[PDB]
Amino acid sequence: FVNQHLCGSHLVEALYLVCGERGFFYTPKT
Amino acid sequence: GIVEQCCTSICSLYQLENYCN
Ligand SMILES: [Mn+2]
Ligand code: NA
């Protein structure tokens, strides 16, 4: 796999693909 | 964290996998 430059909703899409049915947590810094 | 890293730098799919449930 290649490294990634992912901002905004593109990171969410990547997490979805990687994790699949396992689900994931999206937790930006506040 | 990962959200900032992936956007300001780069990140791997292996790093992303740490956020799966
Ligand atoms: Mn875009
Ligand atoms: Na990767």
Q: Which 3-state string (H, E, C) describes chain B?
A: CHHHHHHHCCECHHHHHCCEC
For ion ligand 2, residues whose CB falls within 5 Å: A 1; B 12-13
Q: Is B18 on the interface with A (CB under 8 A)?
A: no
CA-to-CA dists, residue A23 to A8, A13, A16, B8, B21, angstroms: 18, 12, 7, 24, 5
Q: Which two tokens stand for residue A5?
A: 């430059």
Q: Are A15 and B9 in contact (CB under 8 A)?
A: no
Q: Resolution, in Å, please?
A: 1.1
Residue B5 half-sphere exposure, CB side, CA atoms within 13 Å?
10
Chain B residues within an 8 Å CB radius of A25: 19, 21
CB contact under 8 A, B16 and A18: yes
What are φ and ψ of residue A3, in 5° steps?
Answer: -70, 165
* Angstrom distance (rounded) from CA A16 to CA A30: 22
- The count of other CB atoms within 10 Å of the CB of residue A29 is 7
- The count of other CB atoms within 10 Å of the CB of residue A6 is 20
Among A13, B2, B21, which Cα is nearest to B12's?
B2
What technique determined this structure?
A: X-ray
Residues forming beta bridges with residue A11, ordered by sequence position: none
